[PDB]
Amino acid sequence: AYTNSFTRGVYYPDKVFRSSVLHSTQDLFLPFFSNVTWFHAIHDNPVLPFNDGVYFASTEKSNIIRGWIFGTTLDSKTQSLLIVNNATNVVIKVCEFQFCNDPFLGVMESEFRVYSSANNCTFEYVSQPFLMDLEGKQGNFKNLREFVFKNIDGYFKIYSKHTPINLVRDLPQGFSALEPLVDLPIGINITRFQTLLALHAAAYYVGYLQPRTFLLKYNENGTITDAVDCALDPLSETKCTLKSFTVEKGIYQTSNFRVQPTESIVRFPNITNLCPFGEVFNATRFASVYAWNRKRISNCVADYSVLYNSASFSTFKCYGVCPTKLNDLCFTNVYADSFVIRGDEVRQIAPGQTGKIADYNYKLPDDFTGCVIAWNSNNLDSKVGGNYNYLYRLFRKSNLKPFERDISTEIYQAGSTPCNGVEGFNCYFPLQSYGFQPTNGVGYQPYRVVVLSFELLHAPATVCGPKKSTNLVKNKCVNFNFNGLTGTGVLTESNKKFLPFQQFGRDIADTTDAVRDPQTLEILDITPCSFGGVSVITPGTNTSNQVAVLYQDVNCTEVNVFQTRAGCLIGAEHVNNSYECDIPIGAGICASYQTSQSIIAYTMSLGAENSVAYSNNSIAIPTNFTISVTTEILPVSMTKTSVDCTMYICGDSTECSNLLLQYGSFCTQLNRALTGIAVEQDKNTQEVFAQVKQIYKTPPIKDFGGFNFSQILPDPSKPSKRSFIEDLLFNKVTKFNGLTVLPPLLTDEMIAQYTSALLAGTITSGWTFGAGAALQIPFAMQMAYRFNGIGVTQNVLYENQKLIANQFNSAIGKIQDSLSSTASALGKLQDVVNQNAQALNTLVKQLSSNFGAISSVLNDILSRLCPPEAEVQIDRLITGRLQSLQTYVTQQLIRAAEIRASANLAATKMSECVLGQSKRVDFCGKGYHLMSFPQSAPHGVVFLHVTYVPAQEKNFTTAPAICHDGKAHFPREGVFVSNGTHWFVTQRNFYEPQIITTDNTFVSGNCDVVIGIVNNTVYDP
């Protein structure tokens, strides 16, 4: 009866070759994993809906399905497309037919009950004859022939694919693209179709197409190999939104949820009287244009479809509105300006027009809303002897304002002379007339013109169109229409006290806040029905295709379900246990993929909770330490792009360039900004790396006290003398539109030489090469100074020198192992590359946009259209592409500022971390800084920060001071500790107890002042 559809409904949307690209297209496709009807029967079929397009598929072994019928009645009464394959060729006809039996075609061929006539044919096509399977066979099917049948604007598009199969059961799973084959211009309104079966079995599938958006993957050979149905599910929406088939772990915003209306609400005043249009259009006599009439039409039901459909009118031109929308709109008042004019003067009755009537007798506003209605009256107002009862004002000393009625009869003066009702030179009358006779010319015949002026709704409306009202439903999302004002939202009761004259309320945005119900004068608030963005929480597609959906800022009762302050989270199980944050949701909630396995949501942990065993006489002092190496990765530079604004916008087009010149310096200001950026990328690089006045090199003998630097020093065997670690870093980070990339000034080899010099200086001369000359020093002694710099006596290093070197070497090895396996380690630098690449890919894609033009391709506009019309379309494209460049450049300037700040920070670290020793906490890594080593990286720098971290501690009893002979002895830069029986003095950051003597302590004051002073003895050497 039914089966599960699969990845079979994909066809080539057009005939353009694309390869190695993911292309997003919207067309009528079969939704993935939808239900498709299975029609089987062994030992005619029904008439099916076409549903704006039909997916059809069949499995064959003997060519049982041999044709299709498409139409409305499909019975010799309308044109109906008939496609038949009768062992010779495909025959397509749209002829009528008498189906004097349940049509099917029988098997060689010995039966033909499909038809017995051919009458009133308007199209016939026959392909070349072939020969195929006809005799009776039964079993597994051998050939699956899939088809798509769609009707677009009268064109019947047929797509198909034939493929070998070895399968009797349901549809095979597997991607297969459908090529286009036929486009038939027929123009038939198709609502139903039927199939044709061959009787000596039955097997075929019928699906239906829907307006889905698909993301199509074209491989290197231009064959469609996959597709994503966006509205299939949140994961598919995410993949198409990001235009990729792989989604990294995280949360993405892909769409917006909106509760849809369930029913419409149409509300109008309960008026039964009809508007007296007949008394104006069929008036016995029209007024003269010098004295035009204004009839008010109000408190009635108006129907403008009668006037519009009537063919008796010579013109019906609406300004501001248009004639088929007038039925759903209503007005506070409509006024009818009624007068007779000359035919040739109809053009003057319009906004923006001038002339002796437009200026002297009937002026319209240039913002006029309404309709100009006209018809000739040559058989009513014109008379033999002429009709001289219609007067117009020939002369006036001034023009007229809109809707002014100038009834005055003052004597007009051409020049300047007194007139007192006299007809004389420069004493003329403003009143003139025409003598209209049925025999006068076309332009001299009378026309009856009525202009209907509509005053936009503001106040309660009384003259409304023929739309009937409905009942009102509160507290539900509805699509409402109140007196022509439309929108979607939930209508609720309100406490807004509208004044008796007020009809509408407004929000800050001028949107409707509340309405007065036109039937019952109560005030209803309009709150649009709940909506919000929808985010998809997913582990990467390299792990699982299971996702959770977050509906932002909604309640869960308006749609496992977890209510959070971020929204309603669907698909994630709520876990009481806290963990480290993984994929953030918001409001303290994070999600992760963990174990059966599922996506979980939890309140994030801030770290383990602990307490410090504080007391007024207890100090913890470390007895051992660890040397750790951390990696700090900073962007320094970004790719130095340069864009030819002219070639991008106006590629190889003189006409476009000439139009572009009317926009001035916009281009050169973009070239200037990008040049400035490109230059500053090199300034940034020089400031970070060119901090050494000379190029230093290490000695051939690497006698550095056991410290192994072979993985950070250049390896004299590479085409570019980079270290092992640098090679690892470089192995982790991965045009004809006026878009170029400039090379950097400093090549990678030169950067490596600078980092080599900085490293060799640091190793052989410590910090001295930074301040001035490089002064050689044994490395172990350099470390001794670095230890003194953190309050640790140099003797600690020498005594543990071998241990320290091994820890250092091991730490370096661990970095290498980390860098060799974890690609994400350099994400901070990879993102910069991605951001610049994304910016360019977007920019290039903008060239495909129309921006309102007929075509995105400039040459296609130019080769078909000529300048007076072509220039407008080109200006539209220029505006769009120029705005795109302005956006790109602005984003690059902001990003460049971010990079500059990072480069300045990197230079600061280089100066304070590598050339010196930093006293700034966590500036040169967490811990007590010893030394740092630079390594170069693509568009960036990596610092290896060597830090001293206390490793093991004991609880010792302490005291701020010791009493001896009543004098208070305090330690000379150390602390007092007790092992329970004896007091010792020791350095703060490393347990090394010494006997308390007068050379370790100093005396100030006496025992009665110091809080916590203890009794002891002080040894005097």
Place this chain on the structure above:
Amino acid sequence: LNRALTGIAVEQDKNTQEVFAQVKQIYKTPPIKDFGGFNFSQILPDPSKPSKRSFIEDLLFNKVTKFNGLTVLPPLLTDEMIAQYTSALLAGTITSGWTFGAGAALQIPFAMQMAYRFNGIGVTQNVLYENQKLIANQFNSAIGKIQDSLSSTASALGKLQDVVNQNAQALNTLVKQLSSNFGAISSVLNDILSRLCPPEAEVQIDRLITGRLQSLQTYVTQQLIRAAEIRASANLAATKMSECVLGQSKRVDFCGKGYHLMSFPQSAPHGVV
């Protein structure tokens, strides 16, 4: 535009994590507040609030004060979580000095910690102990004065209030732009659509689309620039946290004017004090 705004929203949480999430563990003070006479009751959490914030933090929070496609996302770190981080940083500073920043938190008497801070400015530790009671009273009085100042002068937090105002002003302007015609017959799209039909309506709509899109581009650009300013401030705040609270700063006027001893963080709306 959605991408740019998402990037901003994300970086606001990165900024918060970098400023506050500088401690690997959540520390808590002992039940006995024997800190040598130094009174911290106005900066430590008060175990009685719906959100365990200090008195001063409550004062700070009491001073700082949609259907058009405009939404506000919640922060990842709620105010309670921020308070827990500041509590941990404060407890670490008090009970272990700077040791919790470099590595493990090593307990030390507070008076001795101050002795080290005094040595760090070239003042022998004996000065503190001999004047320890005086110093504690001065500290306690100074804290009380802060409370009195914060309790009466609303303008004290103007630097943070302006940020709120700038974002609010930006949105109010943006929403108001929907009322503009931009050359169209009406700013209301539905009123154009219900009276005019496609060959003429599409032009008026394109005019409104152009105007509203330009308005968004302007808003987003201003937000990106403002966000860069905020990021610089957050980086500075993180730097101070690292050098002022976790350590002791030798940088003149970096951690206030005078010779720096110690600093204490307090959370505030969209900021740190």
Place this chain on the structure above:
Amino acid sequence: LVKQLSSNFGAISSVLNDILSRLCPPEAEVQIDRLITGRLQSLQTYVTQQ
């Protein structure tokens, strides 16, 4: 920025008064809107760079 005032931006003339003194509102308003759009975009660019 000042030089941008000399640009037509598709208008018949960069000088606003020359448009206004020869053309009347139903046609003049379009040319003026073209100049307003261009000059406003120029200011937006200037302010952003500043």
Place this chain on the structure above:
Amino acid sequence: FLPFQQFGRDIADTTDAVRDPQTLEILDITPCSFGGVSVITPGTNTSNQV
């Protein structure tokens, strides 16, 4: 190109390749080489050679 395909396209929707209408072979279209030209010069206060 598949037998029904006549044109190829680039990311920008520009033509990548064409099927020759007289002989059905596929030809790639690569715009002829172009690029910016920069002038390296000492200041005109020294020399006019570039």
